């Protein structure tokens, strides 16, 4: 139902 | 009440994360961190497949090294040349194509003193 995403480097 | 690791500037620390292996959903593992009053920051991620991805934040390149041991179902983060700005709580998370996915958190608090 929910997630936290921490994106890789741009 | 607010316990963690303490390291002097220039010192080192190794973190470890259990890494159950690739699923249809996840193809690696990594770390993010969150410093007091700041947003979550990507640190590093590594693929289970040898040679596929090894990502680092620009702020940790050259100092931090991520590795995997698939026989032990573990990943490791070797943090060298620590500096005060590395002070944060560090969190393990599964990765898909390098991006980190967190559900639910805990973490390892690290204080680096200048």
Numbering used by the authors:
A (entry chain B): 304 to 313
B (entry chain A): 8 to 111, 115 to 124
The authors write:
To rationalize the potential effect of the mutations on the interaction, and particularly the effect of the most abundant mutations in the screen, G115E and R47K, we have solved the structures of mutants 1 (G115E), 3 (R47K), and 20 (G115E + R47K) in complex with a tau peptide by X-ray crystallography.
We generated a last mutant, called mutant 20, containing the two most prominent mutations G115E and R47K that were not found in combination during the initial screen. G115 in Z70 is in a flexible loop (from F110 to G117) that is partially not resolved in the structure (from D111 to G115), whereas E115 electron density in mutant 20 was well defined. Conversely, three residues of this loop (S112-Y113-G114) remained unresolved in the absence of an electron density. G115 in Z70 or mutant 3 and E115 in mutant 1 were thus not modeled in the structures due to the high flexibility of this loop region. Reversely, positioning of the side chains of residues E115 and K47 in close proximity in mutant 20 suggested the formation of a salt bridge that could tether part of the CDR3 long loop to the core of the VHH. Compared to Z70, mutant 20 showed an improved spectrum, even when free in solution, indicating that the presence of the salt bridge influenced the conformational exchange between different structural states. Together with the additional electron density observed for the CDR3 of mutant 20, this data showed that even in the absence of global structural changes, the mutations of VHH Z70 can modulate its conformational entropy, affecting ligand binding. Mutant 20 structural data suggest that the mutated residues G115E and R47K could form a salt bridge that would partially restrict the CDR3 flexibility as E115 is located at the loop basis and potentially decrease the entropic cost of the interaction. In contrast to mutants with the single unpaired G115E mutation, the double mutation R47K G115E in mutant 20 did not result in an improved kon parameter compared to Z70. Among the different optimized mutants, mutant 20 could be the best candidate as a recombinant tool for further use as a molecular probe with the large increase in its koff, a parameter of choice for antibody selection.
